[PDB]
C-alpha cells in the first residue's frame, strides 16, 4: 500500500514537440514503456 | 491500495505541438505506452 | 482500491497544436497509448 | 508499504523533442522500461 | 517499508532530445531498465 | 526499512541527448540496469 | 506609466491567522505600511 | 516607465500568523514601510 | 526605463510569524524601509 | 535602462520570524534600507 | 545600461530571525544600506 | 554597459539571525554600505 500526501509540485515544460511518451508531474502507481 | 491526498500541483506547458502521448499533471494508477 | 482526495491542481497550457493524444490535468485510473 | 510525504518539488524542462520515454517530476511505485 | 519525507527538490533539464528512458526528479520504489 | 528525510537537492542537466537510461535526482529503493 | 501584461500567477496561502496587513497576489501601484 | 510582461509566478505561503506587513507575489511600483 | 519579461518564479515560504516587513516574490520599482 | 529577461528563480524560505525588512526573490530597481 | 538574462537561481534560506535588512535572490540595480 | 547571462546559481543560507545588511544571491549594479 502506498500513502502519498502533502506534495507541493510545480512543473514547467517548454517546447515539447512530437511527444510520444508520458509526461507526468506527479505519478503514483506504475509506468510501463514499450 | 493507494491513498493519495493533499497535493498542490501547478503545471505549466508551452508549445506542445503534435503531442501523440499522454501529458498528465497528476496521475494515479498505471500508464502503459505502446 | 484508490482513494484520491484533497488536490489543488492548476494546469496551464499554451499553443497545443494538432494534439492527437490525451492532455489531462488530474487522471485516476489507467492510461493506455497505442 | 511506502509512506511519502512533505515534498516540495520544482521541475524545469526545456526543449524535450520527440520524447518516447517517461518524464516524471515525482514518481512513487515502479518504472519498467522496455 | 520506505519512509521518505521533507524533500526540497529542484530539477533543471535542458535540450533532452529523443529521450527513450525515464527522467525522474524524485523516485521512490524500483527502476528496471531493459 | 529506509528513513530518508530533510534533503535539499538541486539537479542541473544539459544536453542529455538520446537518453536510454534512468536520470534521477533523488532515488530511494533499488535500480536494476539490464 | 506602468505597462504590466501577460502574467500567470498562482498564489497558495495556508493558516493566515489574525492578518492585519495586506496579502496581495499581484499588486500594481504603491503600498504604504504604517 | 516600467514594462513588465510574461511572468509565471507560483507563490506558496504557510503559517503566516499575525502578519502586519505586505506579502505580495508580484509587485510593480513602490513599497514604503514605516 | 525598466523592461522585465520572461520570468519563471517559484516562491516557498514557511512559518513567517509576525512579519512587519515586505515579503515579495518579484518586485520591480523601489523598496524603501523605514 | 535595465533589460532583465529569462530568469528561472526558485526561492525557499523557512522560519522567517519577526521580519522587519524586505525579503525579495527577484528585485529590479533600487533598495534603500533605513 | 544593464542586460541581464538567462539566470537559473535557487535560493535556500533557513531560520532568518528578526531580519531588518534586505534578503534578495537576484537583484539588479542598486542597494544602499543605512 | 553590463552584459550578464547564463548563470546557474545555488545559494544555501542557514541561521542568519538579526541580519541588518544585504544578503544577495546574484547582484548586478552597485552596493553601497553605510
Amino acid at each position: 500500500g502506498y500513502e502519498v500526501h502533502h506534495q507541493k509540485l510545480v512543473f514547467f515544460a517548454e517546447x515539447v514537440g512530437s511527444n510520444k511518451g508520458a509526461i507526468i508531474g506527479l505519478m503514483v502507481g506504475g509506468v510501463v514503456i514499450a
Side-chain angles (χ1 to χ4, degrees), chain A:
Chain A
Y2 300 163
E3 202 190 307
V4 186
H5 43 117
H6 293 91
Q7 263 90 14
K8 303 187 177 194
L9 196 137
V10 193
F11 198 105
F12 293 90
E14 278 251 11
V16 194
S18 325
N19 159 58
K20 307 206 186 1
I23 300 195
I24 311 140
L26 196 133
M27 161 95 195
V28 177
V31 164
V32 182
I33 309 173

